[PDB]
Symmetry: C2
Subunit: 142 residues, 2 copies
């Protein structure tokens, strides 16, 4: 709606769908992983208030990406894996205009990659259960 | 503008179609790999055709009807004759999925478009289609 562009999601059809939308300013992403991607915390600001939304389960070790001023997310990549009979994100990583992060997780499968030649990630959607079943992104220019 | 990709290798020469008002058809030329593509589209009242990559292989045309648009692109980045090129390519419209075009396996990629459409292409081409990316537009 309102001219949104959404790409993905990559992963399985399990869990419950989530959709953050594109209205917020992402300040940090915390990927929780072990054998696979367990979940993600997305911290954002909106009208001067900071909020964190958690998607996926409670397992894994955290791996944070904190966006500096003038830093934005410009790439996402990972692996869609079969794990415990579920189709989930086995690995997940991101790139900013400053650095590459991860990928986090240890289970390979079907790779996906989102290099963004022009534009940036402005929000998330996907599916979460015990693990992070799937992830997709909203895009906007610059 | 929103440009995602390109997926593929660093060989050949860069190409950039820019965005179209409407894509009419995409013709994928393939054999062992993806040799190239023809894109026919409307642009500021004009109908235009552009060719990217080589002209080997056999053409496979996808014609987009009224109200039909491209909502996905997927493929495999393959190693072929000492080059890294598109080994397979496919597209999905809001009506049906098409492909694969090409026969060489490699590293898969996929671009499902949950909201929006492909409006144009960019990438690299030589004798084959070295790399391909897309311009995205909202619905």
């Amino acid at each position: 709606m309102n001219g949104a562009i959404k790409v993905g999601a990559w992963g399985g059809n399990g869990g419950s769908a989530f959709d953050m939308g594109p209205a917020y300013r992402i300040i940090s992403v915390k990927i929780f992983s072990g054998d696979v991607v367990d979940g993600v915390d997305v911290t954002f600001t909106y009208y001067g208030k900071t909020e964190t939304r958690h998607y996926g389960g409670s397992g894994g070790t955290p791996h944070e990406i904190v966006l500096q001023e003038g830093e934005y997310l410009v790439g996402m990549a990972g692996e869609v894996a079969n794990y415990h009979g579920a189709v989930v994100l086995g690995k997940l990583g991101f790139s900013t205009n400053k650095k590459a992060y991860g990928p986090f997780g240890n289970t390979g499968g079907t790779p996906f990659s989102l290099p963004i030649a022009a534009g940036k990630i402005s929000g998330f959607f996907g599916r979460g259960g015990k693990f992070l079943d799937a992830i997709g992104v909203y895009l906007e220019p610059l």
